[PDB]
Amino acid sequence: TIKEMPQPKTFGELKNLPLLNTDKPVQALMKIADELGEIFKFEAPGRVTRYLSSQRLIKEACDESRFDKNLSQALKFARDFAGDGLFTSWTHEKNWKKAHNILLPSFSQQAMKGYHAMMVDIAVQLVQKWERLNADEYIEVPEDMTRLTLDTIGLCGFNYRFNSFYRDQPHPFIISMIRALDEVMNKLQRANPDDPAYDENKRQFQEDIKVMNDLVDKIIADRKASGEQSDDLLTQMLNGKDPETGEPLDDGNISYQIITFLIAGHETTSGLLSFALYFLVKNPHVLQKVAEEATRVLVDPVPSYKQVKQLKYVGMVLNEALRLWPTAPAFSLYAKEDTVLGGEYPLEKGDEVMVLIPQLHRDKTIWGDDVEEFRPERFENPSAIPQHAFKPFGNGQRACIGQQFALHEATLVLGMMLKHFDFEDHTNYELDIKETLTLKPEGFVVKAKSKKIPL
Ligand code: HEM
Ligand SMILES: CCCCCCCCCCCCCCCC(=O)NCC(=O)O
Numbered sequence: 078t079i080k081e082m083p084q085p086k087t088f089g090e091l092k093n094l095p096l097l098n099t100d101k102p103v104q105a106l107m108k109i110a111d112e113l114g115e116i117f118k119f120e121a122p123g124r125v126t127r128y129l130s131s132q133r134l135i136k137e138a139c140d141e142s143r144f145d146k147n148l149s150q151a152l153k154f155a156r157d158f159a160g161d162g163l164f165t166s167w168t169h170e171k172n173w174k175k176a177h178n179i180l181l182p183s184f185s186q187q188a189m190k191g192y193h194a195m196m197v198d199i200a201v202q203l204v205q206k207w208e209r210l211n212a213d214e215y216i217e218v219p220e221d222m223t224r225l226t227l228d229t230i231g232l233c234g235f236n237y238r239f240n241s242f243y244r245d246q247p248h249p250f251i252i253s254m255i256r257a258l259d260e261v262m263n264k265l266q267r268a269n270p271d272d273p274a275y276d277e278n279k280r281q282f283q284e285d286i287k288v289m290n291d292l293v294d295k296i297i298a299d300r301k302a303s304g305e306q307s308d309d310l311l312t313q314m315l316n317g318k319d320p321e322t323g324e325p326l327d328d329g330n331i332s333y334q335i336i337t338f339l340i341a342g343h344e345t346t347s348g349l350l351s352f353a354l355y356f357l358v359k360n361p362h363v364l365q366k367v368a369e370e371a372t373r374v375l376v377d378p379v380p381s382y383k384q385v386k387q388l389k390y391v392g393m394v395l396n397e398a399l400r401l402w403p404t405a406p407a408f409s410l411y412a413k414e415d416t417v418l419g420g421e422y423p424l425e426k427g428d429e430v431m432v433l434i435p436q437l438h439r440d441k442t443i444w445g446d447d448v449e450e451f452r453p454e455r456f457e458n459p460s461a462i463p464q465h466a467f468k469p470f471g472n473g474q475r476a477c478i479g480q481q482f483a484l485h486e487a488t489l490v491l492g493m494m495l496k497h498f499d500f501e502d503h504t505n506y507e508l509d510i511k512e513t514l515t516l517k518p519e520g521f522v523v524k525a526k527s528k529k530i531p532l
Pocket of ligand 2: 102103121149150151155159162164165265336337338340341405406407408514515
């Protein structure tokens with residue numbers, strides 16, 4: 078029954094590494110997958126992994142009793158500043174489970190209902206900016222989505238105003254974040270990481286990190302002595318004790334969690350909104366249908382928590398977007414013990430598998446032949462979607478803890494955008510996906526014509 082795993086051109090000791098050599102890795106890995114099937118091996122200096130593309134195999138990979146979350150080289154490098162923060166820590170390290178039980182309660186239907194008003198605050202700013210543009214001006218979508226998602230997480234999770242709508246250029250923190258992330262993704266290429274040439278990178282990496290820290294310092298400083306009568310993420314982060322250890326998160330960790338949530342809590346949500354708006358302008362009828370919904374439901378100056386939850390179709394657009402381009406391209410797992418995958422590929426305790434989510438979301442045995450066609454209607458009956466065929470948010474216990482937070486925000490913002498403006502792809506934008514571990518539409522710009530609706 079055994080069938081051995083294929084793999085791309087060998088290329089000496091550098092391994093399969095040269096098959097990439099690009100700032101658009103994932104997109105290359107997708108092409109490779111189009112050739113080699115549902116699975117292939119990928120090697121590099123001191124590491125090896127198998128890339129999965131089918132729901133058949135990924136369905137097994139998602140078996141928690143057999144495979145656990147693995148820190149891919151990517152997250153390993155990303156850890157140089159994130160540390161044992163929920164996203165970059167191992168499932169077994171005390172810190173993960175500890176922080177998980179302590180922070181999770183900040184994502185209940187309760188905390189969410191509390192966040193809404195704050196989400197609206199920032200949502201109003203974004204609508205306001207656009208309302209105030211002059212005729213000859215246009216909008217830089219990703220840039221503004223980043224101002225939103227970032228300001229939203231800062232307000233809701235730390236009661237700190239980044240005030241990105243009062244800045245001409247990306248807030249200093251963002252400039253450093255995207256550079257640190259870019260550095261990490263590019264480091265997966267570097268054949269010899271300590272060789273002089275990269276002395277600039279190291280010099281600059283410690284710098285960008287300091288920037289992020291300084292930001293944290295100022296946040297863990299602003300809370301220090303103000304109306305601390307608020308109970309948000311940062312609150313239950315300093316006044317939270319693990320119900321099974323009586324031990325709260327120490328200083329070193331609380332730091333990492335903030336830096337963790339500030340990045341994981343906006344960057345990919347920024348991309349979602351960007352791709353969503355991208356697909357809406359390139360698919361007029363779909364945009365129309367959603368516009369119809371946004372207006373029919375959002376009948377007040379500001380959206381109510383209930384009204385957002387009613388934005389069914391808007392929510393479908395968001396999933397269809399995440400399907401084609403999951404802003405978090407992949408997550409990895411390793412075999413907990415020795416086992417056989419799909420009854421054909423033998424694996425050894427420790428071996429790691431890599432989930433190529435974009436490809437997973439294109440398996441024609443799950444979605445059909447029009448996989449590249451943008452159809453929100455696909456999510457009409459969520460119950461019918463096969464188990465583990467749609468995974469924009471990771472898997473199991475190590476799945477996105479911010480999922481509801483993100484989808485509620487994106488739904489709110491997209492619903493309002495659609496309520497207050499008509500959109501125009503005035504340059505017939507050509508989709509250019511920029512990679513920095515995550516995915517976003519580079520240089521996507523549009524013009525927006527107000528429908529002139531109050532607030
Ligand atoms: C649409 C936007 C988002 C996407 C697509 C996304 C994607 C993901 C994915 C795929 C994982 C799994 C990582 C892995 O297996 O290595 C994850 C984990 C995580 N996400 Fe999200 N995320 C989004 C928004 C958010 C938001 C808004 C927050 C913050 C409030 C957040 C916080 C986290 C954290 C803390 C983890 C670690 C969970 C754990 O292991 O306990 N994410 N996310
Ligand atoms: C709190 C910090 C959150 C940071 C978010 C990081 C984003 C998660 C997406 C991980 C994407 C990994 C993509 C790996 C693809 C790749 O380049 N493979 C080649 C290789 O690993 O050698």
